Design an enzyme around this catalytic site. Sequence first.
Site, mmCIF file in Angstrom:
data_model
loop_
_atom_site.group_PDB
_atom_site.id
_atom_site.type_symbol
_atom_site.label_atom_id
_atom_site.label_comp_id
_atom_site.label_asym_id
_atom_site.label_seq_id
_atom_site.Cartn_x
_atom_site.Cartn_y
_atom_site.Cartn_z
ATOM 1 C CB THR A 1 -0.960 -0.006 1.200
ATOM 2 O OG1 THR A 1 -1.613 -1.275 1.253
ATOM 3 C CG2 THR A 1 -1.997 1.095 1.147
ATOM 4 C CB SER A 2 2.138 3.690 -2.118
ATOM 5 O OG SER A 2 2.971 2.553 -2.255
#
EC number: 3.4.25.1
Lengths: 4, 4, 222, 222, 229, 125, 195, 195, 204, 196, 196, 212
Positions: free
Chosen positions: J1-2
């Site tokens: 996740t970013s």
Amino acid sequence: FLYX
Amino acid sequence: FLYX
Amino acid sequence: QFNPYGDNGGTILGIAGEDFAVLAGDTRNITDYSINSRYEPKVFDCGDNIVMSANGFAADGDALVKRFKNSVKWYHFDHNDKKLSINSAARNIQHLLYGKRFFPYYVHTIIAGLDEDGKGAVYSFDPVGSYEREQCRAGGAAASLIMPFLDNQVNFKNQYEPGTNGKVKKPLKYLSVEEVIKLVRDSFTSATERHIQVGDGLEILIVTKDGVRKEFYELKRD
Amino acid sequence: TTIVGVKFNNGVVIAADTRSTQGPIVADKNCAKLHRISPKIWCAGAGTAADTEAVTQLIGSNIELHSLYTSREPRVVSALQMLKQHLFKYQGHIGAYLIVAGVDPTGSHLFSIHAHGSTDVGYYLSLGSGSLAAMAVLESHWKQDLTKEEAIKLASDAIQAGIWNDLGSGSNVDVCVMEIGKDAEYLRNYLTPNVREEKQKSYKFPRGTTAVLKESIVNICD
Amino acid sequence: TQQPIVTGTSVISMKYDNGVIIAADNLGSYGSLLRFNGVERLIPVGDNTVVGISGDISDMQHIERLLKDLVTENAYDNPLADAEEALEPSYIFEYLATVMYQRRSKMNPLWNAIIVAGVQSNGDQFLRYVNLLGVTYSSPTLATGFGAHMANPLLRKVVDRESDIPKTTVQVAEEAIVNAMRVLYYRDARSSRNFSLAIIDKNTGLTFKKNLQVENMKWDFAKDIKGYG
Amino acid sequence: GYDRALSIFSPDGHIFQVEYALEAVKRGTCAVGVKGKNCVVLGCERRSTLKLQDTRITPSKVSKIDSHVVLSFSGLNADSRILIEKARVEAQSHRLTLEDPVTVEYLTRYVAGVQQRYTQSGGVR
Amino acid sequence: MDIILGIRVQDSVILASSKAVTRGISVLKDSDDKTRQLSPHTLMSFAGEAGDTVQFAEYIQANIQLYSIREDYELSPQAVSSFVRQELAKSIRSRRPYQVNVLIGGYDKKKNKPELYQIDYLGTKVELPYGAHGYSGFYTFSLLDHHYRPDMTTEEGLDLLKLCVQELEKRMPMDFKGVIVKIVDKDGIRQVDDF
Amino acid sequence: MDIILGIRVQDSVILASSKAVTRGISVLKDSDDKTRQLSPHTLMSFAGEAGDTVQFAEYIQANIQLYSIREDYELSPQAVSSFVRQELAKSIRSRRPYQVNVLIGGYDKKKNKPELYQIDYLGTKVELPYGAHGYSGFYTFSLLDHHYRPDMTTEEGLDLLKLCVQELEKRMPMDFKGVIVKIVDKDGIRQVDDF
Amino acid sequence: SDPSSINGGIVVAMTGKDCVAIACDLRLGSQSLGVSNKFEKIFHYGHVFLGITGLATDVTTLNEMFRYKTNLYKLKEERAIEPETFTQLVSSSLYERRFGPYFVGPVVAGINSKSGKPFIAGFDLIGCIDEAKDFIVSGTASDQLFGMCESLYEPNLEPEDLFETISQALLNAADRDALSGWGAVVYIIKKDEVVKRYLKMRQD
Amino acid sequence: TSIMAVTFKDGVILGADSRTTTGAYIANRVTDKLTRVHDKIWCCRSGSAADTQAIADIVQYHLELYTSQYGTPSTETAASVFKELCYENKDNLTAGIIVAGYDDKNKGEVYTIPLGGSVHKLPYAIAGSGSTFIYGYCDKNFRENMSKEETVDFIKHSLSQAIKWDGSSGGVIRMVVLTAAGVERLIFYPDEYEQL
Amino acid sequence: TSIMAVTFKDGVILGADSRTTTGAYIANRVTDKLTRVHDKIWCCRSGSAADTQAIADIVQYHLELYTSQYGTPSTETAASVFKELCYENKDNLTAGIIVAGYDDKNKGEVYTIPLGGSVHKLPYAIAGSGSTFIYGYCDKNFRENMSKEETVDFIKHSLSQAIKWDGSSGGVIRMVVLTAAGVERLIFYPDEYEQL
Amino acid sequence: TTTLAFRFQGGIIVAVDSRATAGNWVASQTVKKVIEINPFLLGTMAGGAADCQFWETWLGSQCRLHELREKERISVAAASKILSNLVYQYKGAGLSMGTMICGYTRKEGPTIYYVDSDGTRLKGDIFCVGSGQTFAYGVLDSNYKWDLSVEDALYLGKRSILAAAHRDAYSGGSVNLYHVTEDGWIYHGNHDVGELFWKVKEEEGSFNNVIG
Ligand SMILES: [Mg+2]
Ligand SMILES: [Mg+2]
Ligand SMILES: [Mg+2]
Ligand SMILES: [Mg+2]
């Protein structure tokens, strides 16, 4: 138990 | 393996 | 940690007639819930009218078959091209298997052929080389499904002569090669229905005094 | 298990396999994994079979009571919100992985629910052991503005990928088509490509084969 | 006993009428970190064999050296090294298969899944798999890692059994492989867009293709996805 | 290790090192064995050029291998000690595994087997 | 294996050894002799791990019998105990140690004295007037502390031993099927047949 | 606790129960009665975890005695066994279950029949001609299979029971210090004082 | 310490032509030790038959629980419960103990009195319903029973033929399992008569 | 996740990837990790999807009920409610949330709430597995009072690198623009951002 | 630990921090993580200090003995010896080494050897705990055939960020310049690089 | 498994069951658990099927080499000790064998030696070995006398296996009988429990626990  |  | 063993599934089945023997095995090779091959034979002609299958962990299975085939070759060299009798092969395989008692070959082994009297013979081995001649043996994943059916249909277990008040048993008799192949095909279709690791194809190797013949049949591919 | 959901222009379609398994054994050869939450809200379940049935039955009940109370046809987001709040409460101990799909006054909807209480939105989804086989087909063939007959074909093709290639999935293809302004049509056993071949032999026993110790009439009446 | 450090993902392959196709992406993953992007995981041996290797890259580079040394050793006191006594795919495979099983039996495995794709001297297609356990199997379609789960289903729709191989052309087969590589790029978190593809044909010989890219990707429908309900 | 084949065949088909070992026996003090109806007797010569000897502590010519078997010899005294020691060890080893003391034939057959081994082993006379 | 007792009196050593050989929930034998004669005037009783006990006892017996033949001479009980201790002292730092605990009861012909040595499987040797191995000690040591006198006869020693066996039969959980009793004195080793 | 046997014969039920109470390497008592009278014609023998056994037995006894006073009527052996089973069936899914195994030997006055019920700590009830709990069964069941007949007298039943106790005293590892024997018949419960 | 395989035992149910059959072994053991050769695993509440394998204390508890519930059902409904309804009651009751379950493998069998249709159903331990046309299997030799049933079974067997098929299915399965056998019982169920037969089988 | 939130002149911008992974398999390649808790208060969800969804739902309810009684809540108020849930249930939650909102008084504000349940008000924030690779880049490149087009480029280039190196991050780059003008959704496809 | 090797026009440059930590305590704040295996073959040591030192000592011996017999070894030859030790003893080594050397034929070359014992020839390499934070920055900023001053700035700015975010990295920035001119040692102090 | 051998006036009686199991799965009901080493020597098998089968077969080779070398049939003591010394070398390896070496020689007479895989070697007159050893002991001990006839001894040995075959879940199949005399071992047939149980139940009037 059973799974699907 | 088997046993007796 | 590295686990040196795996389960490649499938199931094998050896039945002995009067003047013949069959060794049948499904051609499905699996790992977990994935199909590796729909046709990967694991029933082999090892020469001297001996057919062999080592079902379970395919790597150990192939290694064993390979070593036994090589054992047959060196038996010819060392003993003036003498034919390896099925009983002699069985003892030789015990020594191959037990040699790895403390790092075992993870396989159920069945060999089939003719004894020195020309009669059908099936030998079956536990993973560490304990062996026993039988008329009947199923091995591998679906052994628990097929074996009790064989007990009922080949050895006529729990079957009594009608109207004898369950006093006279159904008499033992040798089955024809036609009747044996019917049981093999019905054993494998039944096993395919209720076991997920069994299906795709059925390969039967039939051993008579004339040599080794093969038969192939489709199984359900789900 | 292999359950997929596909969105078309005027509706959503969910399809599932018909195989239920305990360990490597097939408990049910033809089990329906499509459940009715409401007349126009249907759900496909994977994971613990008991959990998926129970959670679907419970919300299906609460949605009916909510529909009667509000004098309104139930919405897919209501079923989704009630499900994911219930599943979250039990911190994944209820092993229900659902594809929720339906039509309501708001339009057509397709969601996926995980045991831990996470939810996804998509035009095509796949859950269960055969999801990767199904998703491969969906990713290869799915496009925007599918027709009804295209969506049914894509959905059933994605299930078939699971049936053949996944050991967990097999037997038949159930389909439910939920189109806007129409009654949802539940196509049980839409495809039956795994019919058992005729057995080689009838194992109908001669009458009296089984040995009997005692007989007695059982009283079922008052 | 090992644990793999720098790893390569799916190797996918299938037979067609005249030969075999094999493909593998050019990524060396370091766990979740996509560390190295210039890694070749298809290694040709002579002009009739390609060995596709997934798993640990250090062990892959060791296997590279063994195959390189095998070609040298074969040429020694061998006037027919480039003719009748050239290395066959079946020879190269059996050698690796022997090594892989010996290493697992010493509890020190080469942490790899290997697919040997090639064409024998008699024109027969060779395609066989071997892994860190020494497990070997052959099939019209073979794949490692995520390839086994997602590629095989798509490749089997083309060649479902042996009788389908003569009916499958190199155009159809290659298209199926390139499609599978795209699906793997969508759904495998340790895959890359860049990959190599090799064709070993019994007529045209070895065709090695470098710096291929996954393309014709469907992302447009993403704009319409808002929240989780 | 010293490997030299000291015991080898000569043109006339003799092993001179074995025949020269017999000459050492022929030099050794006389030893006689006579078995009666219910007994065996071992007689041994002791050369009388040695006075001021201590017969209490001087190694006796007849040695007990077990409580029921004895061994006398003629030839090199030092060599005899090695055969006697091996025989005594094999006597206890037999009792341990067979749960029965050696027969005289078995004990002989062992000692003879040791003597033979030294006639076609490298580095030993 | 379990119960092995030893009582050194004026002119003899007395070794009592339980007759029960139990495996699982089955008493396989009730007449087992847990002792070997090492030399005419030296007896060793043993208790511990199955197999190890007899294998160790017979190995020691062979070595002492070999020494006796070689030197035409009987090793002193002190000498035999020292040899046995060293073998166990080696054993404990082996790959698989002998899990055998022994009592060596002997009569030194040169000193004209009975000697009792208690050696555990670690190679912990002690000369005692009375010894025991395993749980037996927890009852017998306090009992002997009270009733034992150093100038007792062989007959007094046997009565003192009967008092120990009675206490063990009363308070011990397991049925050890009585004991075989042996006496080591100037005339060698003999077994009491009625106990 | 350990050995509890039961033999239903023609006209009576016979309960044998070991007298040994062992803790650690000490037999604390050799005269323990591992039984409670629930009603005049119902006896329950018990074996299992220390404390739980007596606490459970007395609790059941109190409840059956309360019922007897309330209704001025004796509950049938079938009724008592069903009550006891339900209490154990509740117990097994409790925070701390009763680890108590019981035999209920009773004489049904309405049917004029002896009844023997074998109930384990899980609440597994079975009516048997002969029952045992713990390791005892592994010897006695095969022995009774052979020697037992359904029409035996009380005296024949006691001889059959002596054969069981002898076999257990021969092959059982632990000393259980004999058994207390009690007979349940139409005349109620009485103890055999010489066994 | 696997609750489902301490006591051991098997139940099998089959459908025929206007009839159902349910059969069970009689063994109750404590692992290796055989204890009782009279422990029946098939009960009935009116015309609805229930077979229960698994932990024997739960087999007994559930029988008593369903008798309790079917009795109150009959008093309030003024009619006997039907197999389809009872199946649902079993499922509800088992799932009520979802996070502390009864270690059982129940099997419902019976004929609907109104429709006359043969009905069989199996459940998992958490109460998932397994409905089948052909046969249901349960217990320590379920693998063996699956193999026997799948090969021997054929549709629309007459009561007398169905008896032979279910009996040979149970017997040969039980002989390949250590914890099953020691006697067997077979119920043949028709619309308005039920025959109960005890089978002769090897006692090892 | 970013995920990341950047405060600029006209308000704040929220940026995230669209990849949700179970192990090494991508469950969803078009996730919407940007969620609405109020008309101009949005958050970025990282960690357990189940936990972050459950939390987001509760806060929206709290801010809806807040609005019914006391009118529009401040971005600080929203971050306080997020913190209260995250901190008090820290033992049972795996959630890293970035709260970003636009007031007319306070303008663009960014609050980051790591695993602990601590609150940190920042000029910009980055979180999720992919963030590690762009700490160096984002620190060197971020400036205060950037324009809309500069902030969009800053987020696009940042998440582009995060996606390139992180296996757990990929798919499209979603962005949500919060200004006085209103709410604007932006999307950017691999074919664009990959070759930056 | 933060280490990197960058190949430019005139040769190669090796860069590293000077911090060695046991747990959260700094054992040495002036470590020299750049070591000589030959006159113009140098390496960067990351992982177990004990393991990387032991390895470095063995290779210097191998290349010294190589030079005695066959003259100057190639940078590839040095990397091959490093790999051989690292790969064959992978079970007992925690060492991430960057090998960097200057030939006159081959010019500047960089080989990275991660934990596995694999060899990767790259235009530039980064390794150690601190590297994670500068993948984004280094990828965006690196160019081939840079000048000496550009490469020094690239390394200084890169390690400056790595040091800023990594607890395990700090102290001075050491650099070693390998060109045809010879060997040049450079040092840069916190007061300079911190405020970049 | 259930195996028993006991000594009486008439010689030695050896009875074994014929069943082999893997967990609760019954692998086979037709296994030869007695090996015929030579005309005067018998070997009984319990524990690991492979371990017992392999090492008792190997023993027979060692017993043959003894009589070639020593021109004399090996003693039961020596034969038993070859096996006990072998398994003792493997102690801790996880060998699982419970065996009885039964034979006649001139110097010894009829002799039985219990040998197990933890190295225990016991001479004795009665031994029962296996999962159902206790069930066999129960019937054997309660009926055993030294003065049993060859007919009665053979029956008691058979009945003791049947007793265990019944109660023990892991014992059954068939009973294999042997009788060892001064003239060597004599085989007294294979007896299926399937028929033997009902035959015994009816004739003896025992097994009243079972529904007749
Ligand atoms: Mg499938
Ligand atoms: Mg019980
Ligand atoms: Mg049994
Ligand atoms: Mg720092």
